[PDB]
Structure 1
């Protein structure tokens, strides 16, 4: 799609390979199918389905779509930078002292039985 090239133009990336637009459009189709599918399930849920209790009539307001998307981003879609979590977590790590030692001009390795000894693997 030419409009996908137009959207590429926003990020200064005019060097595509022409498989990307097919692929990303396929992707968005898949994604929105799933989205407005489970939103339709939730529109059914407000319409109180089981093995025969009532009908199924579709409106699909925006709230249902919002629900169907928040569930997806519950386990996907790299969220806002979780800075505070990382700050406190890293303060918990950044708490116990350095070793304050001298291996005296070499490399200090972990002890063997934590080192690997990359021999030819064998039974």
Structure 2
């Protein structure tokens, strides 16, 4: 196909030699889902600005307002290094010698009487 032969070149440019045949079919299904939610929001933004033609600033708005919600990322390095030094300053606690099975408080564990219904 046309758009399915370009999908095998996006993977081969990323060095993916081996892949399942259903991999191309659902990256095209995601790419179709992504463009019919940019352009669906683009004509919502065009009707907000009251213009009959969806021009390039509408797609510039609908991309950056969908990328502000959908595609997130891990926390940044200046945020990870601040919560590290706030946590790594606290000294390590000592251990009670014969406390038993060392566990968190019981509202943080998964150890409850764990009931079930009576069969009748």
Question: How does the TM-score come out when normalised to structure 2?
Answer: 0.72
Q: Deviations over 1:6-30 (max 9, x none)?
A: 2111122211111111111111111
Q: Which runs of 5+ in 1 are unaligned?
A: 48-55
Q: Any residues of structure 2 matched to 1:1-80 within 5 Å, and which?
A: 1-47=4-50, 57-61=52-56, 63-79=57-73
Q: Secondary structure at the match of 2:89?
A: coil
TM-superposition CA deviations, 1:73-117 (whole Å, max 9, x none): 22221337511122212222223221034648x963345665544
Give the RMSD, CA atoms, in angstroms. 2.7
Aligned length: 113
Larger relative contact order (CA 8 Å, sep ≥ 6): 1
2-side partners of 1:87 and 1:15: how far apart?
A: 38
SS in structure 2 at match of 1:100: coil
SS in 2 for 1:58: coil
Deviations 1:16-64 (A, max 9, x none): 11111111111111111110111121122222xxxxxxxx511421x22
